[PDB]
Structure 1
Amino acid sequence: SEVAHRFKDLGEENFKALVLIAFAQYLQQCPFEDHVKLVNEVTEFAKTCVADESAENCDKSLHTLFGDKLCTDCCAKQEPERNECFLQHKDDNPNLPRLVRPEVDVMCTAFHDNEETFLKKYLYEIARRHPYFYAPELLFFAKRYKAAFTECCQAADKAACLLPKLDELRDEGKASSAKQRLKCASLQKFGERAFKAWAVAPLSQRFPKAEFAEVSKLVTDLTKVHTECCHGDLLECADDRADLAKYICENQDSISSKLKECCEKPLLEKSHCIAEVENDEMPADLPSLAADFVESKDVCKNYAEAKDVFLGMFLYEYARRHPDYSVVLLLRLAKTYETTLEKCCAAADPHECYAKVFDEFKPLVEEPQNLIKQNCELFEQLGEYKFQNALLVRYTKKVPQVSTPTLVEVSRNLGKVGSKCCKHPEAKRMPCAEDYLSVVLNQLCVLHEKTPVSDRVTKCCTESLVNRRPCFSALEVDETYVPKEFNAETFTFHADICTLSEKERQIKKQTALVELVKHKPKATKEQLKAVMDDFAAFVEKCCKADDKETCFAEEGKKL
C-alpha cells in the first residue's frame, strides 16, 4: 500500500494538510467545505490501510484515489491522461474574489471558536490562489500564521501586534509562490535537463567546499522533489524533501558550515532554513579554471567521452568561484562554452579555436553589471515610487499590447529591485538583482501565456529561459503599435478614490500613467508630467467635494 507508507512518514496532521492543499490546487473554484469532506474521507480510508495493509483498494495509487474523489471532460478519461488533465487545468489567475481581512477581533474570535477550521481556511485560500505554491513550505507558513494568532489575539493591542505580522507573511508568501512558479515553469517548458544545469549553479555557489559528486547527489534529489511538488504529487514531495533535509544535516560537514544552526531545529524550520542559507566561505587556493577547460589538450576528448558530466564539472567549477554572478549569467557562460567547443572540436586545430573562449564571456558579464549599476543609481536618485514610474513608461512602450493591470503589477515588482538589492555592495548585487528580475519576468510570461496579445513577449518568453532578462531589456519601442483612443469609462468616479491610502493612490496613479502612454505613445517625459499633474490637481479639487460626482462628472466630461 502507498497511502499508508506516506501517512506513516508525514504523520496524520501534515498528511491532512498536504491532501487539502493538493485538492485546492486542482479545483480552485469549488467551495471550502466540499474539499474538507473529500479530505476527511481520504484521511479515514488511509487509517484503515495503516491497520490493514491488505484492506480494500489499499493497493491503489495516490493519483487514482485522489482522482476518483475529485470526480465525485477530465474525469471521463483515465490515469494518467486524466491526471495530466487537472495539471493542465491549473489557473494562474483565477477569477476568485479579493481576499480581504475582517476586523482584527473578528478574526481573533473565529480563531478561538475554532482553531482547526481557521487554519484549513488559510491553506485552502492560499492554495487556490497559487496552484503551484511549494506545498512543504506552505506548511511552514501555516505554522507561522498560527503562531501569529496565538500570540496576538492575547494582548493589550491586537491590530498593532497581528497586522504587522500578517503583512510580512503575505509578502514573503508572494515571493515564495513567485520563486516556485519559475521552478515549475522551468521543468515544464524546458525539461528537467534544463532544471539540473540551473540547480548545479546555485548549489555550487552556496556550497563551494562540496565535492562535485555531492552536489550531483543533491541536484538529483532536488530535481525529484520539485518534479513531484510541481506535478501534483504533494505527499511524496514532502516525504522526499524531509528525507533530503535529513541527508543534508547528516553530511553537514562535507557540504557547508552554515548548515549548523539550521540542522538543530524542528523539521519544518530546518528545511526553510536550508532553503534560505547564505553562501559558505569560498576555499582559498583554487586552480585556475583555464588550466582544465582551456589549456588542457584533452578538452575535446572529455567533451566527447562525457559531455553531460564535463559540462556539469565546468558549471560547478565556475559557479563556486563566482558567488558574485547571477545564476542566469553563469548559465549563459555555460552555454557559450558548450557552443564554442561544439564548433571548435571539429575544426583543424581545436586548441587555437577555443583558446579565447574567456574573451567571449567579458561582453556577457558587463551587460548585466552596467544595467544594475545604472538602475541602482537611478534608485537612490528617485526613490521606489518615481523609479517604478520610470519603468512603467519604459516597458509600456516595449509591449503596449499587454493589459494594464498586468503592466502595473509587473512594473511595480520590477521596480522593487532597487530597494531590495541596491543596499548591497557590488559583489552581492547582480545575483540579487538579475535572479530576482528573472522571477518577475516569469510572472509576466505565465500570465501572458493565457491570453497572448504580443509576439514580442512570446518570443522573449519561450525562446530561452536564461536570456529572458537580456531579451526584454533589448526590446525597442514597438512602432507597429496603434494609439489607444480615449475611453473615459476608465475614469468613472468611485467614492473610494478620495479615501485611499498612499499605496492605493500610487497604484491608481500608475494605472492612469499606463493608459496615458497607451493613448499617446509619442509623448515626452515633460508632457506626460503635465497631463498627469493637471489631472492630479483635478482629482484633488473634485474630492474637496460639494457634490463630487458632479464635479468629477461635469468637469470630467469636459476634460
Structure 2
Amino acid sequence: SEVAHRFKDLGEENFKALVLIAFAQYLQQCPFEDHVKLVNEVTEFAKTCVADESAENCDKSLHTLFGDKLCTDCCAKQEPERNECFLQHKDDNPNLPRLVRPEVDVMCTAFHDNEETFLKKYLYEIARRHPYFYAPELLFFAKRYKAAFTECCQAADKAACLLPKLDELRDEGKASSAKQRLKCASLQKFGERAFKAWAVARLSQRFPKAEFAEVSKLVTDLTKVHTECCHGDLLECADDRADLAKYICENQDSISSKLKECCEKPLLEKSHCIAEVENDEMPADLPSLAADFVESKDVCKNYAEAKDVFLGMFLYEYARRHPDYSVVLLLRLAKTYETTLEKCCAAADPHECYAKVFDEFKPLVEEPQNLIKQNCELFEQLGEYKFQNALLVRYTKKVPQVSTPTLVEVSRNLGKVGSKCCKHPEAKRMPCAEDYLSVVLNQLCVLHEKTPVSDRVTKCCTESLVNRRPCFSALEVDETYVPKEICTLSEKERQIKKQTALVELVKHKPKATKEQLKAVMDDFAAFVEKCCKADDKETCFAE
C-alpha cells in the first residue's frame, strides 16, 4: 500500500495539510468546510491502512483515492486521463473574491477560538489562488504564519506587530508562487530535458566546487521533486524533497561550504534555507574552457559518442565559472554551442569551423548587460512607481491587445526589478534581473494563455522558453492595433488606479507623445484631486 508509506514518512500533521492543498488546488471554487470533510475522511482511511497495510482499498494509488473523494466531465473519466483532466482544469486567475484581512482583533479572536481551522483556512485560501504553489514551502509559510499569530495576538500593539509580518508573508508567497509557476511551465510546456538544463545551470552556480557527477544526481532528484509537485503528486513531492534535503546535508563537504547553517535546522526550515543558499566561492585555478570545448581534437567525437553528457559537462563547466550570468543566458550559450557543433562537425575541417564559437557569445552576453545598465540608470533616475509607468507604457504599446489588469499587474512586477536588483554591483545584477524577468514574463505568458488575444505574445511565449525576454524586449510598438474608442485609498491603491487609467489612456491614442501624455495624465490626476475635495462628489465626477 502507498497511502501508508506517505502518512508514515510525512506525519499526520503535514499529511493532513498537503492533502488539503492537493484538493484546494484541484477544485478552487469548492467551499472550505467541503474540503475539510474530504481531508478528514482520507486521513481516517489512511490510518486504517497504517494498521492493516492489506486492508480493503489500501492497494490503490493516491491519485485514484483523491480523484474519487473529490468526485463525491473529469469524474466521468478514469485514471490517468481523469487526473490530467484536473491538472488541466487548474485556474491561474480565478474569479475568486479579493482577499482582505478583517480587523486585527477579529482575527486574534478567531485564532485562539479555533487555531487549527484557522491555519487550514490560510492554506486553503492561498492554495486555491496559487494552484501551482510549491506545496512543501507552503507548509513553511503556514508555520511562519502561525508563529506570528502566536506572538502578535499576545502583545501591547497587535496591529504594529502582526500586520507588518503578514505584509512580508504575502509578498514572499507571491514571489515563491510565481517562481514555482515558472518551474511547472518549464516542465509541462518544454519537457524535462529543458528543466534539467535549467537546474544544471543553477545548481552549478550554487555549488561550483561540486564534481559534475554530483550535480547530475542533484538535478535528477530535484527534477523528480518538481515534476511531482507540478503533476499534483504533492505528498510524494514533499517526501522526496525531504529525502533530498537529508541527502544534501550528509554529503555537504562535497557540495558547498555554505550549507552548515541551513543543515542545522528543522525539516521545513532547512529545505527552504538550502533552496535559498548563497553561491559557494569560485574555485581557484580552473582550466579555461576552450581547451576541452574548442582546442580539443575530440570535440566532434565526444559530441557524437555522448552529446548530452558532453553538452552537460559543458553547461556545468561554463555555469560554475559564471555566477555573473543569468541562467537563461547560459542556456542560450549552451544552445548556440550545440547548434554550432552540429554545423561544424558536418564540415571538411570541423576544428576550423567551430574554432571561433566563443566569438558568437560576445553578442549574447552583451545584449543583456547593456539593457540592464540602461534601465538601472533609468530606475535610479525615476524611482520605482514612476519607473513602473514607463514599462507600463512601453509594453502596452508592444501588446495593446492584452487585458488591462494583466498589463498593470505585469508592468508593476517588471517595475520591481529595479528596486530588487539595481542596488547590487554589476557582478550580481544580471542573474538577479534577467531571471526575475523570466518569472514575471512567465506570469504574462500564463495569464495570457488562459484567454489568448495577441499572436505576438503567444509567439514569444511558446517559441522558446529561454529567449522570451529578448523576444519581448525586441518588440516594437504594434502598428496593426486599432485605437480604443476612491479618494480614501492607500498609496499602493491610488497607484493601481492611476496606472490602470494610464493603460486605457495609451490604448486610446497609441501614437501619443510623452508630453501629450504628461498633459492628459496630469489633467486627470487634477480632476480626481479636485473631485476628492468634496461637495456631492459624484455630481463632481460627472465627466
Alpha-carbon offset, residue 547 of structure 1: 1.1
| Cα distance between partner residues in 1 of 2:501 and 2:6 | 52
| Cα distance between partner residues in 1 of 2:208 and 2:136 | 26
1:222-248 residue CA offsets vs partner (Å, 9 max, x unmatched): 010000000000000001000000000
Kindly indicate whether residue 539 of structure 2 is the aligned counterpart of residue 550 of structure 1. Answer: yes
1:172-193 residue CA offsets vs partner (Å, 9 max, x unmatched): 0000000000000000011000
| Cα distance between partner residues in 2 of 1:171 and 1:226 | 22
Alpha-carbon offset, residue 536 of structure 1: 1.1
Alpha-carbon offset, residue 499 of structure 1: 0.8
| Cα distance between partner residues in 1 of 2:531 and 2:415 | 31
1:441-478 residue CA offsets vs partner (Å, 9 max, x unmatched): 00000000011100000000000000000000000000
Alpha-carbon offset, residue 277 of structure 1: 0.3
Match of residue 254 from structure 1: 254
| Cα distance between partner residues in 1 of 2:530 and 2:60 | 68
Alpha-carbon offset, residue 46 of structure 1: 0.5
Alpha-carbon offset, residue 501 of structure 1: 1.2
Alpha-carbon offset, residue 293 of structure 1: 0.1
1:375-390 maps to which residues of 2 (within 5 A)?
375-390=375-390
Match of residue 182 from structure 1: 182
Tell me the secondary structure at the aligned position of residue 172 of structure 1: helix
1:512-556 residue CA offsets vs partner (Å, 9 max, x unmatched): 111011000111000100011111111111111111111111xxx
Alpha-carbon offset, residue 378 of structure 1: 0.5
| Cα distance between partner residues in 2 of 1:453 and 1:82 | 29
1:191-227 residue CA offsets vs partner (Å, 9 max, x unmatched): 0001101100000001000000000000000010000
Match of residue 374 from structure 1: 374
| Cα distance between partner residues in 1 of 2:54 and 2:84 | 29
1:294-317 residue CA offsets vs partner (Å, 9 max, x unmatched): 000000000000001000000000
1:413-434 residue CA offsets vs partner (Å, 9 max, x unmatched): 0010000000000000000000
Tell me the secondary structure at the aligned position of residue 11 of structure 1: helix
1:83-119 residue CA offsets vs partner (Å, 9 max, x unmatched): 1100010000011001100000000000000100000
Tell me the secondary structure at the aligned position of residue 512 of structure 2: coil
Match of residue 513 from structure 1: 502
1:12-54 residue CA offsets vs partner (Å, 9 max, x unmatched): 1000000000000100011000100000000000101101111
Match of residue 229 from structure 2: 229
| Cα distance between partner residues in 1 of 2:73 and 2:492 | 43
| Cα distance between partner residues in 2 of 1:307 and 1:36 | 50
TM-score, scaled relative to structure 2? 0.99
Tell me the secondary structure at the aligned position of residue 324 of structure 1: coil
TM-score, scaled relative to structure 1? 0.96
Match of residue 138 from structure 2: 138
Match of residue 276 from structure 1: 276
1:345-404 residue CA offsets vs partner (Å, 9 max, x unmatched): 010000000000000000000000000000001011100011111111100100000000
| Cα distance between partner residues in 2 of 1:233 and 1:542 | 54
Tell me the secondary structure at the aligned position of residue 486 of structure 2: helix
Which ranges in structure 1 are unaligned for 5 or more consecutive residues?
A: 485-495, 554-559
Tell me the secondary structure at the aligned position of residue 191 of structure 2: helix
Counting aligned pairs with the same residue, the percent is 100
| Cα distance between partner residues in 1 of 2:524 and 2:7 | 61
Match of residue 464 from structure 1: 464
| Cα distance between partner residues in 1 of 2:72 and 2:192 | 34
| Cα distance between partner residues in 1 of 2:505 and 2:290 | 53
Match of residue 82 from structure 2: 82
Which ranges in structure 2 are unaligned for 5 or more consecutive residues?
A: none
| Cα distance between partner residues in 2 of 1:259 and 1:536 | 51
| Cα distance between partner residues in 1 of 2:67 and 2:522 | 56
Match of residue 37 from structure 1: 37
| Cα distance between partner residues in 1 of 2:404 and 2:156 | 43
Tell me the secondary structure at the aligned position of residue 102 of structure 1: coil
